[PDB]
Design a protein around this ligand. Structure first.
Ligand SMILES: Nc1ncnc2c1ncn2[C@@H]1O[C@H](COP(=O)(O)OP(=O)(O)OP(=O)(O)O)[C@@H](O)[C@H]1O
Ligand SMILES: Nc1ncnc2c1ncn2[C@@H]1O[C@H](COP(=O)(O)OP(=O)(O)OP(=O)(O)O)[C@@H](O)[C@H]1O
Ligand SMILES: Nc1ncnc2c1ncn2[C@@H]1O[C@H](COP(=O)(O)OP(=O)(O)OP(=O)(O)O)[C@@H](O)[C@H]1O
Ligand SMILES: Nc1ncnc2c1ncn2[C@@H]1O[C@H](COP(=O)(O)OP(=O)(O)OP(=O)(O)O)[C@@H](O)[C@H]1O
Ligand SMILES: Nc1ncnc2c1ncn2[C@@H]1O[C@H](COP(=O)(O)OP(=O)(O)OP(=O)(O)O)[C@@H](O)[C@H]1O
Ligand SMILES: [Mg+2]
Ligand SMILES: [Mg+2]
Ligand SMILES: [Mg+2]
Ligand SMILES: [Mg+2]
Ligand SMILES: [Mg+2]
Ligand SMILES: [Mg+2]
Ligand SMILES: [Mg+2]
Ligand SMILES: [Mg+2]
Ligand SMILES: [Mg+2]
Ligand SMILES: [Mg+2]
Lengths: 309, 309, 309, 309, 309
């Protein structure tokens, strides 16, 4: 059983980077639309008895990409692939992980059920919005972390990183920032709203680094950055694993005081970089490629939680 | 068939680093000396049907270490190991690779024959003194290169690396330096002796980096560094993959003008670092571990010739 | 046990010269081709209990000549010759002596293995491309040197030889030229490429003598000669032990500034001399004959490294 | 371990047919000549841990093709292929399988030794001239038979095949023809020379089918066909597994009385078909492909001795 | 072909004694260490067509001496010596001649393989620990016996030798002592441990002579001597062919009751004699010289099993 990497249409550059790191060519697949806009998928090579990995992120036209992924999984499964793995760098509907006093769907659970019923045997993803989403599955889920790559970027790009403060934009992400603060041996601050925000932790004359899983409309991080500059910070960075940047995010970032907005490439960023000078991209294709290769060879994946490959 | 890593007594720190990078514990082996100083080897665990890797460098008490390696290979082979690989970071007797108008042995060929007859199926080594030594074997030999790690060190440690000159100490190593000069887009200079040395290539007001496979007595690199300072160089570095440092090497380096003497850890360096402040060590255990893991899994090893893992 | 000299079809003039110097007639052998172009060999006399020497150079139709040599060795060995020696003035595939970051064969090692398995007990050759090729064998290899004959030619043909400069075309051959420069007590210069070439050593108003093991396409020596004339040299000679002269070599030499291109007769040269006026031939049949006679009589062969017989 | 099929330059059409029947693409390899006509081989993809099959027949420029095959085997073996198999449809030097009161080489044994020393683990060939050549190896040799394909051709092309006579051109091939005569339930005749030939077996008013392993100069089969027409045969066919057709074979066949000269495609035939109308080709690529696939999967190869796949 | 005797650095006095008995001078060889402690060997005279004997015992720095011997053998073999013989008075790793329910090497077999692959044609040794080691070779091995010299010493040094008892220290050596007891016409006793030892055979008022192949730490012979004095012996001698005397052997012998500890000079003894008064040395250089001369002249070597020359 050999590795076969297939790309959905969502993030083809990431799939190519992963394939190069694995020393493989992308599997032959046609993924287009019929005239009535139904997804058309044709696997152009035999996957019989192979270990198939389908790379598709929850970005762009999310429902189209999700249906493409489900259809590709189904096609590979009924084509007698030995194992089918969904590599989903940004998990769609992850923020709908609970009801919370509302007659709302748990869309993340529905997506997990659909992936299971399509025939996925395994899920590889990066920085799930809530790690409880792992429990939405009955198949194994490897939730990778961008934190090693983030730490690497911080050390090689922020000269004052030993005196910086890692800041959570809200009370929800504090855990994450504390982890980073522990790995860098720096202070960590929290910010939460009472339209006013309150900040705990000295940030004067120090570089502040907001850290988060995602930036969708960037209202949260822009408000946090305004507060950090109010409290005497020297420069404010924002580091996010998922740069969705929908709606007014680009305009707000352009009008914000960030020195840089670093995001990983779990979502393609070329279009946003055109209209926003201060967006920078961390490659995480090495982490994804190593996770694929370790799941295939039966090596430890959790080794990657703390080690940059 | 699983990976089993065994350490000879020559370089136990390197073996441990490799084992950690592989996520494995070192195999149980007793390697001591009988009273009459014959090597005693006892494999403390079953290696039947396993892929065995024995790590032993040509350093320290070279003949003792070589005999230890041969005895361990023999013990694993008659213990029904599926495959036995010798991981020899610094190949012993590599400099005796030819006769050249002398009634001399070709000791490198003798060592290759002894390794083959002991039962080695495969050799992993780093920067063979002459790559023709690969032809001394009939079994496959993977000759790894420290060059990716050297390039990484140069970029992250020499601030002026874009304006530096890579210098060969002699005409023999020019190929190597040209390779490095190609990967950095810098000038390359040669130095050869006519007790006088002649240098080709502008080095004034520029950082010079001597590059070589090994430093035994360091007469070559010390003379080259003196010449480089004569020709107006600003600082002179020396980068070698094998830091043997025998005889008067430490005193000469201490009396030399080197800013630093960077060597890889194919040979243990802790004792030399005690008596020489300007020696610095590049870890190459990641390259060796990746080579072991790729030979085991049937992935491409030559991928490592240009990529730091 | 008497000497029997057999000629392959590659270089019959050299075999005849060697046989005359030994006071012997060439052994009766038929070496032709079957209709389907397979080599046909028939030993026309008994070689039982004899010391057999088969002369065949790696020239012309190289694979045909090599197969002829292997077949003749096999025929003599199963005909109960006491000892079989391959006299190979120019060793085929000598330039494929290593892999060097390529998925390439080590063809020189393969040729050595084939010669050993055909039944060769001993190899006599001249100026191996790399002396490490000696280690590719387990049988003894005598690598003779054309240097004594070259020194003789230089003294008797270049009137200004005491003020000449011996020049290496590249960094690889410097050793050789230094040896010659030591035996003549003259200056030695190096030339290496950075499409531009750099020359170290005064050559103005002095005769320059490029020295090398072989000239295949003569791009190297022609570029070196152009550079030497640029640097004010009076006349430029080229002396090579192996005159392969394949491809465009004859046209380039005809368009080059060489006063003469001296080569030994390890490879037949009559055809090339027809189309190139400035090619001159040094006879080395005396060295080969003396080496054969000394190996037969158990006298010192290395005596020939410095003495013209 | 996957199948990798590599083509030598001798018979690229056959290699492509085999690759298509296996559902594979031919492995990336460069096989050209250096300027001095030495074979140049570069394996363009990793073969590490793979089951490598190199297809090269003993045809055309036989010594060049044989050296190409040996060099490719060596390149794959030192590139750490798990297993290397030589697929040699027509075995070179097969007719030099003995000495027989001559001081001649046993060239077939030399070729076997060279293949073994190059690193071949297994040989697949078709209709060895003498099956004793199998004993020239110590590695397994699968000698396939064209007889099933020949029987198929006879039944579907000769309408009178139930009343035909299978004829041996000489006493040596009688076994073969008897085998065929047994599988068709027809008469079998022998022909041997006393310049006159004597024929045993009624052939009047019956179609005669000469059968043989090879046709080199076609003197044997042309003389046999003349004798068969003398003895009242209606039509004479010739069926050979190896159509070498060297020397005057094409002219003799054109002047002969054969209805057809059927040969297998162990040797490329397109050029000969241009100048000879009555040559016809049986495809045996299915037999070779099935043999490769069965050796790879550990299924029975001898199943193919009697079954067309 | 003449005799050439070369000395390794292990036992130069023995080599000189052998050379004098042969009427020869020791061959010119340089055997030193490079700076990094690799063995350096240079044969200072032509050995072409000669019968070369290299004398090196398994004593002192055993792995260094063994590597020296292998390198010297290789140098002589590629220097076209007609025959190379290793004269190894004490065979290294002889006690590691089996595994015996342990995952241990058979180091003696490895040493034999290394000697064969270095190019040894013949082995001369004295009192192999187990004569089965002869079967570890495919080349002839002459295992000489010190017994004639021991018998001579006993008769000329022990006045009561006709009434003495020859004693084995263990059950393993009984054969040897019985041989001696047969040649002297005396009683023979055995001793074996049950920390207690049991002795069979009357030894009261009689001189006892322990006999053995080697004394390494001398625990065995010291315990045996204590038991012999317990059983009423008058004086106790110990005679060993190999006096290794490593570890605490000298102190134990000094504290033991031995009248004398006689050893042969297969291992140099001058240093041990300085610190131990009761060590005495039998010269066996006459046996070794006669064995060399008889192998050279084709005379019977086994003649020496019973005759002092
Ligand atoms: N794609 C989406 N874009 C924007 N809002 C979304 C999206 N999907 C779900 N939501 C809504 O966003 C809210 C979830 O917000 P969020 O994850 O920031 O906070 P939380 O889950 O309440 O707390 P926390 O993550 O801090 O523990 C819900 O009201 C949910 O319906
Ligand atoms: N361990 C050793 N320490 C020192 N010198 C050694 C050692 N082993 C061999 N030598 C000697 O060193 C010489 C080889 O030197 P070196 O490798 O620097 O140059 P080279 O092979 O002549 O040329 P180059 O490597 O530049 O092509 C030989 O004379 C060899 O005998
Ligand atoms: N017959 C041949 N003709 C031309 N090129 C060849 C031939 N055989 C091998 N080569 C190629 O030529 C190259 C070897 O070149 P060359 O011997 O001039 O330099 P090198 O070995 O890199 O260095 P140097 O000899 O200076 O130490 C390799 O790429 C090899 O594949
Ligand atoms: N390529 C070749 N082309 C032509 N003749 C060859 C070739 N190779 C060898 N020969 C010669 O052909 C003869 C072998 O002929 P052939 O195989 O037809 O008959 P055989 O071996 O004597 O008997 P049979 O095969 O009938 O049992 C030998 O003299 C051999 O030297
Ligand atoms: N150089 C050495 N010094 C000490 N012990 C050694 C040495 N080499 C091997 N040994 C160990 O010594 C043991 C062999 O002991 P010894 O030869 O005295 O007895 P044996 O082979 O069991 O029996 P015996 O020789 O009486 O038939 C083994 O355990 C072996 O590993
Ligand atoms: Mg939430
Ligand atoms: Mg949040
Ligand atoms: Mg060297
Ligand atoms: Mg050097
Ligand atoms: Mg070269
Ligand atoms: Mg060159
Ligand atoms: Mg025949
Ligand atoms: Mg026939
Ligand atoms: Mg024992
Ligand atoms: Mg004992």
């Amino acid at each position: 059983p050999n590795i076969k990497i297939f790309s959905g249409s969502s993030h083809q550059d990431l799939s190519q980077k992963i394939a190069d790191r694995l020393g493989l060519e992308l599997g032959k697949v046609v993924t287009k639309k019929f005239s009535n806009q139904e997804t058309c998928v044709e696997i152009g090579e035999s996957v019989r008895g192979e270990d198939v990995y389908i790379v598709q992120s929850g970005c762009g036209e999310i429902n189209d990409n999700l249906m493409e992924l489900l259809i590709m999984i189904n096609a590979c499964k009924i084509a007698s692939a030995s194992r089918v793995t969904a590599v989903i760098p940004c998990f769609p509907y992850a923020r709908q992980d609970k009801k919370d006093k509302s007659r709302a769907p748990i869309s993340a659970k529905l997506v997990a059920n659909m992936l299971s019923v399509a025939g996925a045997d395994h899920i590889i993803t990066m920085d799930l919005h809530a790690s409880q989403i792992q429990g939405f599955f009955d198949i194994p889920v490897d939730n990778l972390y961008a934190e090693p790559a983030v730490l690497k970027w911080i050390r090689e790009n922020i000269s004052e990183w030993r005196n910086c403060t890692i800041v959570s934009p809200d009370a929800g992400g504090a855990k994450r920032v504390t982890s980073i603060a522990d790995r860098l041996n720096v202070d960590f601050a929290l910010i939460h709203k009472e339209d006013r925000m309150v900040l705990v932790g000295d940030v004067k004359d120090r570089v502040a680094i907001l850290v988060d899983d995602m930036a969708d409309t960037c209202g949260t991080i822009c408000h946090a950055a305004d507060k950090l500059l109010s409290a005497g910070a020297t420069r404010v960075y924002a580091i996010l694993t998922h740069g969705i940047f929908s709606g007014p995010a680009i305009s707000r970032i352009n009008n914000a005081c960030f020195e840089a907005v670093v995001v990983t490439n779990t979502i393609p960023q070329e279009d946003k970089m055109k209209h926003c000078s201060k967006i920078q991209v961390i490659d995480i294709s090495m982490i994804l490629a190593e996770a694929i290769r370790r799941t295939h060879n039966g090596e430890s994946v959790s080794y990657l939680f703390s080690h940059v490959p």
